[PDB]
Design an enzyme around this catalytic site. Structure first.
Site, PDB file in Angstrom:
ATOM      1  CG  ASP B  65      33.682  74.148 -22.365  1.00 18.04           C
ATOM      2  OD1 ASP B  65      33.740  74.918 -21.383  1.00 18.04           O
ATOM      3  OD2 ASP B  65      33.000  73.102 -22.362  1.00 18.04           O
ATOM      4  N   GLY B  71      47.628  58.689 -20.450  1.00 17.82           N
ATOM      5  CA  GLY B  71      46.805  57.930 -21.374  1.00 17.82           C
ATOM      6  C   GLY B  71      46.955  58.399 -22.807  1.00 17.82           C
ATOM      7  CD  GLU B 376       2.508  20.477 -20.292  1.00 18.22           C
ATOM      8  OE1 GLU B 376       2.963  21.444 -20.937  1.00 18.22           O
ATOM      9  OE2 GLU B 376       3.222  19.533 -19.901  1.00 18.22           O
ATOM     10  CG  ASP B 450       4.242  23.313 -18.921  1.00 21.22           C
ATOM     11  OD1 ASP B 450       3.413  24.168 -18.550  1.00 21.22           O
ATOM     12  OD2 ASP B 450       4.258  22.147 -18.475  1.00 21.22           O
ATOM     13  CG  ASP B 452       8.816  21.478 -20.970  1.00 21.46           C
ATOM     14  OD1 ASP B 452       7.692  21.904 -21.305  1.00 21.46           O
ATOM     15  OD2 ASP B 452       8.983  20.384 -20.391  1.00 21.46           O
ATOM     16  CG  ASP B 454       7.859  16.363 -22.574  1.00 20.72           C
ATOM     17  OD1 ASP B 454       7.725  15.399 -23.356  1.00 20.72           O
ATOM     18  OD2 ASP B 454       8.797  16.446 -21.755  1.00 20.72           O
TER      19      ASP B 454
END
Lengths: 519, 754
Positions: B65, B71, B376, B450, B452, B454
């Site tokens: 570089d 740490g 629906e 929908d 869900d 049903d």
DNA sequence: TTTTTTTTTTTTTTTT
DNA sequence: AAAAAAAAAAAAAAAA
């Protein structure tokens, strides 16, 4: 991809299996332990949270329905209200779980008043159906939004499944359980506790058969025996009818005093009228309904050229004065459907009460030990009040005061020395590390105890409050001893359960309504 | 000093948990990219301009570089050496490491000032296996991509063993990337679209060039991290490109001359594009970082593309003409691929055409350019009608659940719901004598029920109607299924739509692992995100298995079996070993018991197999029961999963282990505590909005999710086997209940089992 | 104020 | 005898 092909077999299978499992688990069948469906459970939980106590004032049914729909039940109004209506009316349930005001219908077929008119309150038995709910006796499941929590099952004291019965339809299954008498069901439970290897013959001696809310006659007993052995059987329910003969003239009248279960009186009268008009049933001159709010009285006038007994037998055979009640005892056990007989249901209820009482005792013991810890802190503080106030005055902030109090070990006073050593072990909470507590006549407060001492008010320095703390500590030690005695011996658990069941039988005792006959 | 050695040993005990899969050689390249990423993070601050990576003949990799000069590190723990030289503050310093153990005072002086740190790390042959050397192609590819993304950054590369060289220095950046991608292919116009405008902190760079390959290739990055699955930047890019090209064709009138409407996948056909983004706090669907789910990025890309692509098209008429010609040719090919059809009267203000009142019909008279959404109810109908495209999309709202035509008679089909469906489609399905599917008014019939239970049931009923009464319509592929979301979840600025509860569970796990660092030791680096994600996934799988096993055995015993040592078949022969194992298990169960249960053990000596199997007595709620761990359980496969997770979780948490979530920190003693804390912190600001049908979704939300063709996710219903479909429909939907009960119970048992 | 479907047992019509 | 069709109980989906 925007568009991805899917086979019609896979889509149909997945969708229909999701629907079937959802209906079977949630809505159709009841749970064997508390005998309630999720809609019933959520309605009762919402009413309890609102505070619809049996001795409090009524509340509008619209408020309860809106509370249930908004928080717990995502499946739309006008079915929750139908459930509340069925729970509130006495001709449906043997022991009503809701105390309603207004028009909730009748056996004549009148529909209940709208949601805006009626008012709703818990029945007294529904409180014993939800006893010790706050003592973590049951598992709480999350809400559909995750914003709240609902009980997974109620900590019941009444065998609600056998008592109130059930009726529902799943996709594959369908449950049909008749109601029973609470005293006889509790006697069966007590007999099971006395001898867990009890036969269904003994359970039948204690429980002769179902007891419908509409008093009636059950013809046979082979159906009852088949239902209580296999879980399925056919029962015939007859009407209470008498061919009353006039003394002055030979003409006779047939008076139906009582009607079978789930039979509408208006449709019965209409069907008798249809049979008379079509001349399928002969001998009937007139037909009336003279129910004077003192029972019921369906008068059927027999013609002169008719025996009357034959007319009544023909009415039994053709009309709805005889109804076949198909028993099908299907209920959720361990979260799956299962056909269950009488002994299975009683054993499941007794297991549920075992779990409830054990969890309640664990919660109470933890609470008592925590309060004993706090009271030890307060007693040691009031024993050494002068250096504690001096330390608190000298410190600049409450955090430094807490650190100083934790750092300094504290001498036990004479009152604290006699109080604490009398308690001995079996009063420290389990989570407490052995570093803290009494160690060679010197207390070692925790951070929580130092915080409690800082929260101590100047009112507690009065002479009476120290004696109050001493008395409360002694009471908590006695309570801890009793709770440990319950948790140690398996026979004491059954003693507690039997005492609770006997008290429940005493409070809500009731007499038989339906008669079991031999034919 | 002693704390450093503990961290190095913690890293070296489980090197796969930190660096990645060391067997196939990904770990070595990950180490090289870690050092190069440190160098490039230095370079982004306008300091460095040269990164000379090398591959020496001694199996060592230098990363030089020329920057500013800096740490327990993961890179130096695995490598058997370092050569750290930092030419900072006018004097060259040098440091030497060996398995992370420094041997120097870390302070030396030298001549010349210069800048930058050069680090030659020597990978240890002990940790890595089967791949010792470095593949030049992988490093060259990633370094060239970094050079493209980081414009004006020289990145040399010098393979010293071979003597090869490279010099990646492209000031154009994304334009150079597109040129590199298109050098092998044939671009269809010379210019390259490009911008690098920044707005609201979200730096955005995009480029485009079309070619003759009719293939789509859009690459996307976020902080120089590629996204395989695209994300919000990809969605915004696609939406803006489609909008700009459609508006350009509408303005100039190219489409009217061709008499064809271009759509998505025609503009994207034969496209090369790169989409580089720089979010300060990006959010991804997983720790793999294969999909960006940051809600703020779509709007920025959309706005900048909408402005600048149109601005480019205005100033480049020839290239716009060529691209529009290509798109017209693609649209003509798509039109020629269609089936023959005829125009149909559409319901309108002047003429109603004898169609139902509830039908909100469209304006396009041509089928194959129109859609029908079967919803629906009337509230869902209103929500869908408010947000739609009136030109293409029609809506026919139903009324709750419809007749089961499998159970119902043919003459029972006199309901208002089914007659309304038959009138709109105009197949004349009633009678099975006039049923002509050529007169179908819409070639795209979308079952938008929908989201869900049903809704699923009503979808099944509609599928029964379409399969039984109109079988050829299903065969031709006209029937589609929309997938509207069930949940919307929000954490401040972030927003997401979730379809299923399994997706909700995956999303909750993703938030739990979002920005979470797990430290096995107090002084040690955090685990890799992917390793922790794999650990949590396997843990949840085993927990689901244990919940399935809850009836046969207690959950506490099975959960304790994870941490205990494994018990092989050979252990069962010895009386002493099984007694010691079950004694340790029962003692651990008794120690950590928060309830009234009391655990005891026994050993039953089998005379047949000549083994000593263990038993685990338990006395819970006053009820005493025995659970013999028979020979089937030891080799049952469930215990194999428990043992594998145990082997992974034996020692991942020492005494001083802890986890962090940025500012917050928590010491932990078990993986359960860490998972619970992460979930609890995840669900702090959370807010789930469940939609009980489309009437609760706004029209804009319904349009964005599952009506827009750009963001749609549909499914074509197809019939793989006619006979199997007939059998399944008859069993699930017929009159007889016993096959339905058998099917449901069989699937329940299959779900309970493997 | 009012009405239409799904779902499973069980009975009663009615029609052959 | 046979076989199909209709109605009724309770939770759900929909509206007028």
């Amino acid at each position: 991809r925007e568009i991805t092909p899917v086979n019609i077999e896979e889509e149909l299978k997945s969708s229909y299996l999701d629907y079937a499992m959802s209906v079977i688990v949630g809505r159709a069948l009841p749970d064997v332990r508390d005998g309630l469906k999720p809609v019933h459970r959520r309605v009762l939980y919402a009413m309890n949270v609102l505070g619809n106590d049996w001795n409090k004032a009524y509340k509008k049914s619209a408020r309860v329905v809106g509370d249930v729909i908004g928080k717990y039940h995502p499946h739309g109004d006008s079915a929750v209200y139908d459930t509340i209506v069925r729970m509130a009316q006495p001709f449906s349930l043997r022991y009503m779980l809701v105390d309603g005001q207004g028009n909730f219908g009748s056996i004549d077929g009148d529909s209940a008043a709208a949601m805006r008119f009626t008012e709703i309150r818990l029945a007294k038995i529904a409180h014993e159906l939800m006893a010790d709910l706050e003592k973590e006796t049951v598992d709480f499941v999350d809400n559909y939004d995750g914003t709240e929590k609902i009980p997974d099952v109620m900590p019941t004291k009444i065998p609600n499944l056998l008592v109130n019965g059930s009726s529902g339809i799943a996709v594959g299954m369908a449950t049909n359980i008749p109601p029973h008498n609470l005293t006889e069901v509790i006697n069966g439970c007590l007999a099971y506790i006395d001898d867990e290897d009890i036969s269904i013959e003994g359970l039948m001696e204690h429980i002769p058969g179902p007891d419908f809310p509409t008093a009636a006659i059950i013809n046979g007993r082979r159906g009852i025996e088949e239902a209580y052995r296999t879980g399925r059987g056919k029962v015939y329910i007859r009407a209470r009818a008498e061919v009353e003969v006039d003394a002055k003239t030979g003409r006779e009248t047939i008076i139906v005093h009582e009607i079978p279960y789930q039979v509408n009186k208006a449709r019965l009268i209409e069907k008798i009228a249809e049979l008379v008009k079509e001349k399928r049933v002969e001998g009937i001159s007139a037909l009336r309904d003279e129910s004077d709010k003192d029972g019921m009285r369906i008068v059927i006038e027999v013609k002169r050229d008719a025996v009357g007994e034959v007319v009544l037998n023909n009415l039994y055979s053709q009309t709805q004065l005889q109804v076949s009640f198909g028993i099908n005892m299907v209920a959720l056990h361990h979260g799956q459907p299962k056909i269950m007989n009488l002994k299975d249901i009683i054993a499941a209820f007794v297991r549920h009460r075992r779990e409830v009482v054990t969890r309640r005792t664990i919660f109470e013991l933890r609470k008592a030990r925590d309060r004993a810890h706090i009271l030890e802190a307060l007693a040691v503080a009031l024993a050494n009040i002068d250096p504690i106030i001096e330390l608190i005055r000298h410190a600049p902030t409450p955090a430094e005061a807490k650190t100083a109090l934790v750092a300094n070990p504290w001498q036990l006073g004479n009152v604290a020395a006699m109080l604490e050593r009398a308690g001995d072990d079996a009063a420290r909470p389990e989570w407490l590390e052995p570093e803290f507590g009494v160690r060679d006549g010197l207390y070692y407060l925790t951070e929580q105890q130092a915080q409690a001492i800082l929260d101590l008010r100047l009112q507690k320095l009065t002479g009476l409050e120290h004696e109050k703390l001493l008395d409360e500590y002694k009471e908590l030690l006695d309570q801890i001893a009793e709770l440990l005695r319950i948790l140690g011996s398996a026979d004491r658990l059954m003693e507690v359960i039997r005492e609770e069941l006997e008290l429940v039988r005493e409070q809500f005792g009731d007499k038989r309504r339906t008669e079991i006959t031999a034919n | 000093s002693i704390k450093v050695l503990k961290g190095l040993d913690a890293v070296r005990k489980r090197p796969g948990m930190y660096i990645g899969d060391t067997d196939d050689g990904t770990g070595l390249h990950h180490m090289v990219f870690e050092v190069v990423d440190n160098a490039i993070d230095e370079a982004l601050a306008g300091h460095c301009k040269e990164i000379i990576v090398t591959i020496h003949a001694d199996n060592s990799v230098s990363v030089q570089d020329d920057g500013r000069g800096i740490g327990v590190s993961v890179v130096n723990a695995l490598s058997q050496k370092l050569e750290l030289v930092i030419q900072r503050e006018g004097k060259i310093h040098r440091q030497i490491y060996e398995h992370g153990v420094p041997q120097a005072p870390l302070a030396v002086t030298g001549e010349t000032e210069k800048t930058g740190t050069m680090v030659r790390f020597w990978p240890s042959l002990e940790t890595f296996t089967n791949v010792t050397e470095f593949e030049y192609e992988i490093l060259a590819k990633r370094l060239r991509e970094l050079s493209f993304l980081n414009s004006g950054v020289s990145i040399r590369l010098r393979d010293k063993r071979d003597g090869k060289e490279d010099h990646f220095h492209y000031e154009g950046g994304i334009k150079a990337f597109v040129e590199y991608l298109n050098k092998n292919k044939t671009p269809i116009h010379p210019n390259i679209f490009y911008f690098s405008t920044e707005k609201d902190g979200i730096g955005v760079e995009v480029a485009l060039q079309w070619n003759d390959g009719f293939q789509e290739n859009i690459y996307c990055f976020t902080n120089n991290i590629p996204q395989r699955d695209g994300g919000t930047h990809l969605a915004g890019f696609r939406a803006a490109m489609t909008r700009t090209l459609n508006a350009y064709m509408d303005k100039e009138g190219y489409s009217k001359k061709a008499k064809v409407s271009a759509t998505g996948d025609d503009a994207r056909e034969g496209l090369i594009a790169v989409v580089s983004v720089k979010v300060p706090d990006p959010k991804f669907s997983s720790q793999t970082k294969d999909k960006l789910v940051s809600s703020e990025v779509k709007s920025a890309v959309e706005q900048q593309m909408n402005e600048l692509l149109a601005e480019y098209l205005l100033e480049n008429p020839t290239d716009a003409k060529i691209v529009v010609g290509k798109i017209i040719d693609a649209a003509r090919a798509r039109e020629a691929a269609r089936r023959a059809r005829e125009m149909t009267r559409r319901k309108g203000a002047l003429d109603l055409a004898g169609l139902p009142g509830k039908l909100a019909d469209c304006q396009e008279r041509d089928p194959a350019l129109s859609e029908l959404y079967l919803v629906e109810g009337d509230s869902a109908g209103g929500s869908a009608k408010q947000g739609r495209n009136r030109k293409n999309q029609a809506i026919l709202p139903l009324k709750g659940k419809i007749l089961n035509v499998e159970k119902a008679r043919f003459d029972k089909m006199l309901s208002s719901q089914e007659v309304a469906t038959l009138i709109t489609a105009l197949g004349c399905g009633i009678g099975r004598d006039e049923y002509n599917p050529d007169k179908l008014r819409y070639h795209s019939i979308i079952i938008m029920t929908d989201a869900d239970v049903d809704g699923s049931h009503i979808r099944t009923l509609l599928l029964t109607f379409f399969y039984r009464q109109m079988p050829e319509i299903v065969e031709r592929g006209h029937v589609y299924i929309a997938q509207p979301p069930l949940y919307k979840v929000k954490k401040g600025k972030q927003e997401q739509y979730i379809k299923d509860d399994e997706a909700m569970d995956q999303y909750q796990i993703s938030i739990a692992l979002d920005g979470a660092t797990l430290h096995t030791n107090a002084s040690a680096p955090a685990l890799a995100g992917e390793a922790l994600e794999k650990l949590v996934s396997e843990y949840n799988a085993t927990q689901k298995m244990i919940n399935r096993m809850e009836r046969r055995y207690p959950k506490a015993m099975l959960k304790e079996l994870i941490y205990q040592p494994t018990l092989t078949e050979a252990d069962l022969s010895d009386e002493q070993t099984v007694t010691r194992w079950v004694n340790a298990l029962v003692s651990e169960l008794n120690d950590k018991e928060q309830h009234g249960s009391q655990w005891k053990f026994d050993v039953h000596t089998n005379a047949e197999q000549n083994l000593f199997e263990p038993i685990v007595r338990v006395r819970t709620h006053g009820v005493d029961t025995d659970y013999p761990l028979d020979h089937e359980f030891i080799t049952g496969g469930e215990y194999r999963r428990i043992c594998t997770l145990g082997e992974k979780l034996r020692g991942l948490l020492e005494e001083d282990a802890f986890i962090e979530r940025g500012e917050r920190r928590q010491p932990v003693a078990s993986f359960e505590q860490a998972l619970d804390w992460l979930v609890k912190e995840s669900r702090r600001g959370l807010s789930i909005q469940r939609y009980k049908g489309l009437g609760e979704m706004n029209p804009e939300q319904l349009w964005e999710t599952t009506m827009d063709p750009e963001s749609r996710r549909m499914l074509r219903v197809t019939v793989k086997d006619a006979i199997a479909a007939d059998q399944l429909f008859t069993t699930l939907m017929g009159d007889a209940v016993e096959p339905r009960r058998a099917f449901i119970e069989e699937n329940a048992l299959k779900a309970a089992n493997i």
